[PDB]
Amino acid sequence: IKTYHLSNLTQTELLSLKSRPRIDFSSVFDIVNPIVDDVHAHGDAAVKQYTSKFDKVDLENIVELVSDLPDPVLDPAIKEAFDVAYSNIYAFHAAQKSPEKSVENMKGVQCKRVARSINSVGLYVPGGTAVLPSTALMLAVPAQIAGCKTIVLANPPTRDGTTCKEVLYCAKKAGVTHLLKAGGAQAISAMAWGTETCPKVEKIFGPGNQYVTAAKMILQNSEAMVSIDMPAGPSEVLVIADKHAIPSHVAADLLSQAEHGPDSQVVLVIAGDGVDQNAIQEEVSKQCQSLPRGEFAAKALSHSFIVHARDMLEAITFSNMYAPEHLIINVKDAEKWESFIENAGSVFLGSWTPESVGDYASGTNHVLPTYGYARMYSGVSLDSFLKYITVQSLTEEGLRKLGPYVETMAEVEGLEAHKRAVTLRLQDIEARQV
Amino acid sequence: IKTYHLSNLTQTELLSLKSRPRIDFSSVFDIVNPIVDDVHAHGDAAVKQYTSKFDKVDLENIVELVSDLPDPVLDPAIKEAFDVAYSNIYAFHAAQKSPEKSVENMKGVQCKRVARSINSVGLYVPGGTAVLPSTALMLAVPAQIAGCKTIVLANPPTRDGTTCKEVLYCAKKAGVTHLLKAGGAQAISAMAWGTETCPKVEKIFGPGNQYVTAAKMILQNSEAMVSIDMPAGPSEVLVIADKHAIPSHVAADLLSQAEHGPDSQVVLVIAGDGVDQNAIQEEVSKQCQSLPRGEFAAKALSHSFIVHARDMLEAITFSNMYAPEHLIINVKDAEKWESFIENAGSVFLGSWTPESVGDYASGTNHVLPTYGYARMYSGVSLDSFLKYITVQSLTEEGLRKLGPYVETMAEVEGLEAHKRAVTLRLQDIEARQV
Ligand SMILES: [Zn+2]
Ligand SMILES: [Zn+2]
């Protein structure tokens, strides 16, 4: 409910706004380490125990090959909607391919950067009661485009043990190879180390909850030889609204984020004068009462806050400091403010572009950096699933011309074998002129 | 000396060749962790103390604004060599800028991905017994191209408290804003947390020794809010050689990697037949005893190994498994095999392209993934210094076309607030034209 005016604040007060409520992950590591170690040591049996324990389901086989599962049949309207998403997500991400053009800054010194897919990747889509086929498209489409050979999707089952069929449809469309019917730390460990039946993966994506996230943090510093997309905290939106924003559409934007759960973070920034803060707030109350996830949204909004900025430059400056997962800019001429944005996972410009268009189908990626990590991490993209290999090839003339400079730098550095690798080659070359 | 043949080996045995020796991080962690904490709590005073103990230097001004440092004067061959290097590294990295073309897969649905620099960055360049201006260019040039506002270059001082003069030259050329005259874990903490005079940075780059590396690793899972380039181990080279390779050149390539240190890892893969392995081992021995760092190279070569492959495909396949920091391909028609390489930091094709060319001046980046982390990490590049923000903007028509698909997918996921944010908007649009 809290309201702040940027003119009222000291440098110390600013800073407490920039930082999210502390999550002590050390605490969460203590809970997660035994689970990670158990799966590491005892494999599928251990995974089955934790799945029985936490998801209250007992599994025969925790992994299946997706190409052996039947094509599920969906309501045609539902199917077409996910085909549209797929199509837009596919096109946005395919357009991120780098051309691989060679640089020749001196004659005969040809260098280039080429993309190779990460061979094996693991994707975490939360499950049980959550039905998250959208996240499945977000992780698997760019994997598919990148060409990854093994694609493990981890998706904890419903209370009976049934795979969410929309997720499965999405997984089949994006070439997921393996479906791992587990969640939690236990699923992260199984992909990081591999098991009797779950392939070992080289990189793991999707933030899951704070327990998934902790295991990812832990396993990236372990011997498992696994990298992750990014660390994480709760989901967030920051909305900037000016007097041209419709109060009820602003309210709906706040609740759209709030309904993700009690820990979602909402920030309303009011840029300029003439905005009816009251109407927005009342409109939030009215809309919240009919939401089936209204209890979640209300718990979330109990630690939301409002910020008054006297102008749009101040609003954006505050948003840059904050570094929001999602940024909504509902102000006149929103597009013009783009070159002022420095830190945000994803940006929604104007009045017709709610967060859920990006959550589902605009084509951008919704697995975005939270907690302030947009300061140095990007949302998942095609490049998240590639390594770039640098290549250089010299001709004789190139080495003739570049070698001496190399000789010089190696001497300066005290590295004489580095020098001789070149000199010995130059001797051979000069020896073959008569 | 030690040799293997790919035909003679079991699965069990290949997998042993793939994996590097384990490093005891536990002992390193015991050293590093209280250093980090101490710098976090006590700032520059804590840093001064550690510099005094390990580097044996007592210095009051540990952070220097590079602007008001006088240009060093170095001999002119040396200036000219680093200038060529600067030029090739610049050109190579500048060619990596993405176009930011908008995607419009459905009329009025406009999406894009824009580059924004990481606002502050830290660059680690080893000192004391090392002199590493090449690394200064490798880290600093793409930061400068990326437009990072604060660039902190950590480099421990020489015994009199001065900065290594070649390193300072490269920092001024590449636009480093601050110089932190400290090394080791204490340097890393100072950049990760900020001190009284050292700016806090968002990302830290550069291998260092195992103390630096452990500090980077701890700090990436800490509350400091800092990412890292990549984890790391000892540097490595894998050289693929066929019968057309000149044995002495092959030997000088191995020594070039080996002279880095006793842990530097070296692998020779002999592909096909007609290769004088003896001439190569003889040549390694003559060359090794005529080197200043010959004792370092010999210790490294004691844990080197050879692999015989019946053909080049099998050689490449083995190399793809091993996933070397550096790969040299000295075979016939080396360029043609490019498409078969899946895992390698940087590649050197043909007879005239030694590792040291890439270490110094080809333009590629020498800060590369070791220990098999080439399976999922790239070398440092322009992208390492950027976040890519995704942007979407819808017209009214765009939302009229895409919104209904989104309402449905929101229904499926049980996320009514996500649906309503679209519906209120579609209602407003409908109200207006009637
Ligand atoms: Zn959402
Ligand atoms: Zn080197």
Numbering used by the authors:
A (entry chain B), B (entry chain A): 43 to 476
Task: List sentences quoted exactly from the publication behind this structure.
In the MtHDH complex, IMD creates two polar interactions, one with Zn2+ and one with Glu455*, which bind indirectly to domain II and directly to domain IV*. IMD faces domain I but does not interact with it. It is possible that, for stability of the dimer, there must be a link between Zn2+ and Glu455*, as we failed to obtain a structure without IMD (or an IMD-derivative) added to the crystallisation solution. In the MtHDH/IMD complex, Gln299 Nε interacted with the carboxylic O of Glu397, whereas the Oε was H-bonded to the Oγ of Ser277 and the Oγ of Ser306.
HDH (EC 1.1.1.23) is a bifunctional enzyme that oxidises L-histidinol (HOL) via L-histidinaldehyde (HAL) into His in two sequential reactions, each coupled with a reduction of one nicotinamide adenine dinucleotide (NAD+) molecule to NADH. We show three crystal structures of Zn2+-bound MtHDH complexed with: (i) imidazole (IMD); (ii) HOL; and (iii) His with NAD+. The three structures reported herein are isomorphous, with three dimers (AB, CD, and EF) forming the asymmetric unit. The MtHDH monomer is composed of four domains.
